[PDB]
């Protein structure tokens, strides 16, 4: 009494998810145009679940600091997995997740000095810092 499609992850773990939320990823619904798990390249089975939680929450959305409250708490995850969430929202073509995750990294870069930016995620000569200032 509910529609379901299989989605094979990069690891190989198949996910039986509803088509109404899989349709949130426009690459999956367009892949069905013109009874097998649809492939999700470069998307691990762990990130796939994190992708589902964001999509299954945004099932009622058709497409100034606009960061949502629940999403910014949903993105209280390690920096590594956040980058793995940006790439997926490009592979699955998720305009909401692609923007919320990119705006959050920019929020991590904004308001900080270049050293404070590098200290969060990490190669200059002594004049290279002065030459870049020019």
């Amino acid at each position: 009494a509910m529609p379901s499609i299989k989605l094979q992850s990069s690891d190989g773990e198949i996910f039986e998810v509803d088509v109404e939320i899989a349709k949130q990823s426009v690459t999956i619904k367009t892949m069905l145009e013109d009874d097998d798990p649809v492939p999700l390249p470069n998307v691990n089975a762990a990130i796939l679940k994190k992708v589902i939680q964001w999509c299954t929450h945004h099932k009622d959305d058709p497409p100034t600091d606009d960061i949502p409250v629940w999403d910014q708490e949903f993105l209280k995850v390690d920096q590594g997995t956040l980058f793995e969430l940006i790439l997926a929202a490009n592979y699955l073509d998720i305009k909401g997740l692609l923007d919320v995750t990119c705006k959050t990294v920019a929020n991590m870069i904004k308001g900080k000095t270049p050293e404070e930016i590098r200290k969060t995620f990490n190669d200059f000569t002594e004049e290279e810092e002065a030459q870049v200032r020019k």
Binding site: V105, I109, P114, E115, I117, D123, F124, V132
Partner: protein, 35 residues
Amino acid sequence: WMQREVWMSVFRYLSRRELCECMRVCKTWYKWCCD
């Protein structure tokens, strides 16, 4: 690789002032903001 297109995308949301300081972070970033 993987760092070019993702970092260039977060640069669009940062205002023109933030991209000015973004060049002094790294050389790979310095080559990216000038494209």
